[PDB]
Design an enzyme around this catalytic site. Structure first.
Site, PDB file in Angstrom:
ATOM      1  CG  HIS A 270      -0.615   0.261   2.501  1.00 14.31           C
ATOM      2  ND1 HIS A 270      -0.623  -0.748   3.449  1.00 14.31           N
ATOM      3  CD2 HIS A 270      -0.184   1.401   3.084  1.00 14.31           C
ATOM      4  CE1 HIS A 270      -0.167  -0.200   4.565  1.00 14.31           C
ATOM      5  NE2 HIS A 270       0.106   1.093   4.394  1.00 14.31           N
TER       6      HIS A 270
ATOM      7  N   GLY B 191       1.603   5.902   9.702  1.00 10.81           N
ATOM      8  CA  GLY B 191       3.036   5.808   9.436  1.00 10.81           C
ATOM      9  C   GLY B 191       3.744   4.627  10.088  1.00 10.81           C
TER      10      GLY B 191
ATOM     11  CB  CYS C 166       2.106   0.732   7.391  1.00 10.62           C
ATOM     12  SG  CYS C 166       0.422   1.157   7.896  1.00 10.62           S
TER      13      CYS C 166
HETATM   14  O1  LIG Z   1      -4.475   1.082   8.594  1.00  4.18           O
HETATM   15  C1  LIG Z   1      -3.833   1.986   8.071  1.00  4.18           C
HETATM   16  N1  LIG Z   1      -2.990   2.799   8.757  1.00  4.18           N
HETATM   17  C2  LIG Z   1      -2.758   2.687  10.146  1.00  4.18           C
HETATM   18  C3  LIG Z   1      -3.174   3.664  11.043  1.00  4.18           C
HETATM   19  C4  LIG Z   1      -3.040   3.437  12.401  1.00  4.18           C
HETATM   20  C5  LIG Z   1      -2.489   2.236  12.820  1.00  4.18           C
HETATM   21  N2  LIG Z   1      -2.068   1.283  11.976  1.00  4.18           N
HETATM   22  C6  LIG Z   1      -2.195   1.520  10.668  1.00  4.18           C
HETATM   23  N3  LIG Z   1      -3.970   2.241   6.686  1.00  4.18           N
HETATM   24  C7  LIG Z   1      -3.598   3.556   6.133  1.00  4.18           C
HETATM   25  C8  LIG Z   1      -2.577   3.458   5.009  1.00  4.18           C
HETATM   26  C9  LIG Z   1      -2.793   4.498   3.896  1.00  4.18           C
HETATM   27  C10 LIG Z   1      -2.770   5.935   4.433  1.00  4.18           C
HETATM   28  C11 LIG Z   1      -2.952   6.976   3.326  1.00  4.18           C
HETATM   29  C12 LIG Z   1      -1.910   6.812   2.225  1.00  4.18           C
HETATM   30  C13 LIG Z   1      -1.923   5.391   1.671  1.00  4.18           C
HETATM   31  C14 LIG Z   1      -1.748   4.353   2.784  1.00  4.18           C
HETATM   32  C15 LIG Z   1      -4.607   1.319   5.808  1.00  4.18           C
HETATM   33  C16 LIG Z   1      -5.941   1.507   5.469  1.00  4.18           C
HETATM   34  C17 LIG Z   1      -6.633   0.496   4.819  1.00  4.18           C
HETATM   35  C18 LIG Z   1      -6.003  -0.694   4.491  1.00  4.18           C
HETATM   36  C19 LIG Z   1      -4.666  -0.841   4.793  1.00  4.18           C
HETATM   37 CL1  LIG Z   1      -3.859  -2.329   4.376  1.00  4.18          CL
HETATM   38  C20 LIG Z   1      -3.949   0.148   5.436  1.00  4.18           C
END
Ligand SMILES: O=C(Nc1cccnc1)N(CCC1CCCCC1)c1cccc(Cl)c1
Ligand SMILES: O=C(Nc1cccnc1)N(CCC1CCCCC1)c1cccc(Cl)c1
Lengths: 304, 304
Positions: free
Chosen positions: B41, B143, B145
């Site tokens: 992603h 951030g 990830c």
């Molecule tokens: O969960 C996510 N983030 C997160 C926040 C808090 C804690 N752990 C992680 N995200 C956000 C990733 C996107 C942000 C904007 C730019 C493109 C990347 C996410 C959203 C849906 C599916 C997936 Cl795989 C990942």
């Protein structure tokens, strides 16, 4: 989201762990620049620990008696000196992995990470609090002496604790990096009273703010209280009295959440008087006091 | 003595953390040998995440679009490939700090340490359990990830988890280092059900053994039970059914303490049916399931 008992990354401290052997006793040392810091009881045998005369014991030792091993390489000891309850062994080589560091004496209620070590090898890292009675509730076995407590501000490691002793009650006692014990403890195999401990009120309130930020809100109520009223309840439940300084340090969390400090105190007063009623706050069934207001802000903002 | 939620020393994993930027999105990467592993992603914008067509999105990207920064130095990207939900960026330089490593898919109920990172910089380390429903209760913000989960056997780091997503319920979802999600999760901004979670019975029993070793014995009783009887209670309280394999893995602790596994089950049955009655076990007011039998043996013996 989520809230964990987070330790600092231990990397910068791992690169400073060495093994120190004097005669038959082996413990951990801290190699910073050309100096190895270790508990002075490395010069004792089990027999000496009843009432050691460290000045006399050290006099029978020479630089060549202190065997210092950094992983697998031997360090040449060119000097030795006792400062309070630590031994400083001057080595001929500066540790190439020495990070930017400070020696700081932490206050009771402050937190730090411990890198538990055996034979100069790290086994694990956990986040601790210096109890108001100057003990720590660590996880330390025989040979863990010399393991250090620290905090990290960007690239600077502030060393604050060195493990020396386990009290007969299972709690742990140690020194700052100048060899001065936290508390009334002495490095001797004798029963030593740790004072009456209390709960770190400011930290519980900080952890109540962390819970609000992360979704746990069931404990919030329609009440407020005064510092005087709250302190009468704090006294009754062995909690550190809340001061304006603690309220001032809770400012950031109060502002981020919009919950006034005395309103959060009122929630803590109800939790103290009524318990959790079979509920949990951030996965804990009790009031957590090992996260300072700074720890909560750091974890909730992502400070690296 | 003492018992803490101990993380592995994070040093070997810190030396592998890099920052990965693709367009406007920045997350963490894992640099091992000449390959950088990160969540796929990284190639998306917030807009794409509703139903990303990763094959199409990756097609519009070249090696020069993947900006990889190791602390402060830039890595030259010479190849890119998607494997399941991870991107593997071939770099022209092998990471000089690459430790001995393996990629392993952990089982539900197993534990690991997480080195939380932001912009390729480590912020902290905590010990987690892979829940029976394949989620983790971490501490991760925007951030985070790319932050990885791992275990360490002497000098070998076994990578088992990479952080990808936070479910709308505040729990966390991620993959093994081959990009395969743990659980039914997909890397898409959609509400996704995490299954009914259960308590890891074998781990609670291991933690009851750790408590006995460390002094907490109040929960021990004059009762015994059978696997059948215990499992009826386990069913009622949403606990994983205990099998002979779990009893066999509890062997070491049963032998060290002299408390038969089914006798310890009988103590757990009484704690389940009656609660803790305002008491604590190893500082916890609830039944802890994030320490495996191996973790307890390692911590109680001092394995470095
Ligand atoms: O969960 C996510 N983030 C997160 C926040 C808090 C804690 N752990 C992680 N995200 C956000 C990733 C996107 C942000 C904007 C730019 C493109 C990347 C996410 C959203 C849906 C599916 C997936 Cl795989 C990942
Ligand atoms: O507490 C100790 N160890 C310990 C064990 C478990 C957890 N944490 C620490 N010790 C033992 C140190 C002696 C062992 C035999 C050889 C000479 C050194 C100790 C005993 C009295 C006073 C002092 Cl300062 C230290």
């Amino acid at each position: 989201s989520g809230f964990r008992k987070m330790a600092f990354p231990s990397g910068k401290v791992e690169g400073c762990m060495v093994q120190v052997t004097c005669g038959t006793t082996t413990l951990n040392g801290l190699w910073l620049d050309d100096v190895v810091y270790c508990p002075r009881h490395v010069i004792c045998t089990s027999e000496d620990m009843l009432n050691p005369n460290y000045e006399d014991l050290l006099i029978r030792k020479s630089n060549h008696n202190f065997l210092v091993q950094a992983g697998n390489v031997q360090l040449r000891v060119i000097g030795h000196s006792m400062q309070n309850c630590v031994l400083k062994l001057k080595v001929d080589t500066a540790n190439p992995k020495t990070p930017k560091y400070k020696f700081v004496r932490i206050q009771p209620g402050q937190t730090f990470s411990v890198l538990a070590c055996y034979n100069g090898s790290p086994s694990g890292v956990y986040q601790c609090a210096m109890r108001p009675n100057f003990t720590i509730k660590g996880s330390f076995l025989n040979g863990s002496c010399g393991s250090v407590g620290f905090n990290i501000d960007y690239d600077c490691v502030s060393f604050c604790y060195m493990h020396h002793m386990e009290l007969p009650t299972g709690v742990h006692a140690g020194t700052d990096l100048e060899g001065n014990f936290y508390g009334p403890f002495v490095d001797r195999q004798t029963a030593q009273a740790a004072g009456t401990d209390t709960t770190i009120t400011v930290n519980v309130l900080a952890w109540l703010y962390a819970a609000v930020i992360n979704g746990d809100r069931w404990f919030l109520n329609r009440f407020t209280t005064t510092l005087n009223d709250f302190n009468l309840v704090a006294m009754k439940y062995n909690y550190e009295p809340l001061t304006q300084d603690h309220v001032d340090i809770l400012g950031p969390l109060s502002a981020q959440t919009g919950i006034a400090v005395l309103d959060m105190c009122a929630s803590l007063k109800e939790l103290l008087q009524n318990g959790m009623n079979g509920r949990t706050i951030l996965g804990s069934a009790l009031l957590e006091d090992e996260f300072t207001p700074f720890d909560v802000v750091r974890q909730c903002s992502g400070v690296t």
